[PDB]
Paper text:
For this, 3Dpol uses the viral protein 3B, in this context usually termed VPg (viral protein genome-linked), as a primer.
Interestingly, the three virus pools each contained a single missense mutation compared to wild-type (wt) virus. These mutations were located either at nucleotide 7115 (A7115G) or 7127 (A7127G) resulting in amino acid changes M300V and [name] in the viral RdRP, 3Dpol, respectively. Markedly higher inhibition constants were observed for the two resistant mutants (M300V, 26.9 μM; [name], 10.3 μM) as compared to that for the wt enzyme (1.3 μM). The apo structures of the [name] M300V and [name] polymerase mutants were obtained using the same crystallization conditions as for the wt enzyme, yielding two different types of crystals for the mutants. The 3Dpol [name] mutant crystallized in the space group C2 with six polymerase molecules per a.u. and diffracted to 3.2 Å resolution. Structural comparisons showed that the mutant polymerases were almost identical to the wt enzyme. The main differences were concentrated in helix α10, which contains the mutated residues, and in the preceding loop B. The side chains of residues 300 and 304 participate in a large hydrophobic cluster linking α10 with helices α2 (Y75), α6 (F194, A195, F199), α7 (I210) and α8 (L241, F255 and F256), included in the inner fingers. The substitutions of the methionine and isoleucine side chains by the shorter valine in the mutants imply a weakening of these hydrophobic interactions. In contrast, I304 seems to be located relatively far away of the GPC-N114 binding cavity. The structures of the [name] 3Dpol M300V and [name] mutants suggest that these mutations increase the flexibility of this loop, thereby affecting the binding site of GPC-N114 and probably losing a direct interaction with the shorter V300 side chain whilst retaining the ability to interact with the template-primer.
Author numbering: 1 to 460
Amino acid sequence: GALERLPDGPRIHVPRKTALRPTVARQVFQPAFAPAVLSKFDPRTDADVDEVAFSKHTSNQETLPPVFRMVAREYANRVFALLGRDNGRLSVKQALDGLEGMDPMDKNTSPGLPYTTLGMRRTDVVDWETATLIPFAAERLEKMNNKDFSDIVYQTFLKDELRPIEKVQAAKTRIVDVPPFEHCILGRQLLGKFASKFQTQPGLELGSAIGCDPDVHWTAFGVAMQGFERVYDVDYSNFDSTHSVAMFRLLAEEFFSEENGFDPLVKDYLESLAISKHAYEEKRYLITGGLPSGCAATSMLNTVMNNIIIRAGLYLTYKNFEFDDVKVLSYGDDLLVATNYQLNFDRVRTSLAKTGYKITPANKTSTFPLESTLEDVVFLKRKFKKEGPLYRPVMNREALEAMLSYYRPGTLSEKLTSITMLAVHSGKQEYDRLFAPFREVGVIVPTFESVEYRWRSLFW
């Protein structure tokens, strides 16, 4: 919200060509999907894609009800009771290498401005052996330690991916925000030690599916939500952008605070996300509110806010409502409510509408069903398919066809390998149907029994 125009500067090229190309299986399945619109002169749409991206960000909420604060600090108590309040700053060595049971920073990811303009990669700007930034990058990280984030400009561009034909026709393409590499390092310094603990324990108590593995953890999520009377599926609309600047303050003061064992600089880092400066072609602008993408923190941040927001809506809608009445499971804006009560999310939608957040039923029709169970819900594009004492992540049939219909030249073998581990849960008949197009044109893929056996090996 609140997009303020700044003085224009050097041209930072937004890419306007898809790398996606159709496979041999596109003609077979013909999914309701196509590459996202990137150019203004894309003939598949009437609309200007830059206008549609800039039409969003109207204005976030200035204020926010007082119930958001108490439910935030009450959620904080539960989280830090389990994980602990030893969430101090990590060294630059620890940030790059990552802690034990935490992936190291990706060397391939974009380094951000001005390194992308100069044609440099992440491994140019730092030495991973010694954890040593080059003089230019080192002094910028120094200034951010001294409470100054004035140099930080997000490289912003359109997301190259598949979209529904309606999103392609309407030119509604998602926006990627790439922060500078030093900003991304500093983020993992301040919030890394906490993130490592949050990743390792996904479940209903922490209220998060972050750092899970659908093959294994679906059985754990399944059995945990099994005993409950109902399970609701709730989806937000523009969850990242609708975060108010007040929400960021709440997190800094109540959740990611020095009381809970965080670095004092965390507050200033969170303000860099709250009020951020972006570069798009020659345009420069300033968005007040909403969480930018980029780096590993984004999914965790939304997961924390999601547990707060959904309960705050319930507190507002349902009087004498309890915190433990609802058990939550979420991976960012993908939300899953488990409860013994009977909740009406039509009235919760109207409550949260006033607070800025917009929920939807996730079933293409404006009616949250009063009755809903574990078998009905869809979480992470997957369903909960019980099989003996286990649960299998059965992925949507229309999703699987869409994934196989397009690809990026060069990395086709890597793609097919990963999709076999998804399609295995749909059954041998469905499995061999989905890969038949590729085998038809002389492309070998592993047997169903090979990959099905591999999945069963996880539980031995």
